[PDB]
Amino acid sequence: MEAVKTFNSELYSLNDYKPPISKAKMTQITKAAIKAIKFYKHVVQSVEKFIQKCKPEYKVPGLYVIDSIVRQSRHQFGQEKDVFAPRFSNNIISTFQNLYRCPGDDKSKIVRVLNLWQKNNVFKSEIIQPLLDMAAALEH
């Protein structure tokens, strides 16, 4: 799958940069995801695999990838037609378990994204609440 390989290249290329990741790079990754929309399941799988396996400093960049793809898809295809948020929702507990293996000072960045997803109805509130609870439990 050409489009999936192109996306994989953009995503893995995060490893060639020191975080914080630039807007330009995030845009590149996002554009590749959207071009690969026929294979959205493979795109989600690749992002989840990156988050599972990447160095701790890339956890938050990985989350930003999810954020950017989902928000761009909702914009470009419509909030109700977006295939990405529903697909990312499937393994989201797993994803966040992996995300919270970030450095201590990056935990607040994860919660910031969760709060924005809730405020902006990016994901269903039922999905988000356990992810926030996981953040808080880590502080106790």
Binding site: I21, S22, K23, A24, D67, R71
Partner: peptide, 9 residues
């Protein structure tokens, strides 16, 4: 400029 989740699409 670096990516922010508060920035528009």
């Amino acid at each position: 400029p670096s990516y922010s989740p508060t920035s528009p699409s």
